[PDB]
Design a protein around this ligand. Sequence first.
Ligand SMILES: CN(C)C(=O)N1CCOC[C@@]12CCOC2
Length: 185
Amino acid sequence: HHHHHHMVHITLDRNTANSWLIISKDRRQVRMGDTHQNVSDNKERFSNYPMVLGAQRFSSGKMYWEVDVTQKEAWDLGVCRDSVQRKGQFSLSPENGFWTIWLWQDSYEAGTSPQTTLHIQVPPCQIGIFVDYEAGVVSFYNITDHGSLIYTFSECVFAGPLRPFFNVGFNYSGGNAAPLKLCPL
Ligand SMILES: CN(C)C(=O)N1CCOC[C@@]12CCOC2
């Protein structure tokens, strides 16, 4: 792909984070803490899952960023509507305002309803995310495998401003403590 030139500098929005997340001082890395991180509750925080949004809002144009997923067992990545539900249980689906892929139990899947099996030969250490607002497109690229396509959501109905979306996953196993990191441009 030739999307690299639409690179945007993404930072994480503390105020949206689940109360167990630890966001680095530079707002470029996030990991699951082993306890509540001593923050007040607010209506923005994701309550049920280890999720956080980027601070940036996109309503037009072409945007590209990269995320490091090294050594993680489980995570979700993509974009979502600014108006997504924060409290209680929900599925990741375009009907609920999410355009995502994930790793879970040694398989990669796209967040369609129902979910779609992904075909990845080289487990990725870094993921590239491309959004074309006007075209209604969200695409995912395997940076570890020369930028090979993972998945394209097309005919997307964004229906509002979009925010970068992250889930570091639970760490019940003791094997998923590693952070998500926004990679330098
Ligand atoms: C750490 N853990 C397994 C949790 O139970 N947490 C803590 C972080 O917020 C989400 C919830 C899941 C169920 O609601 C609370």
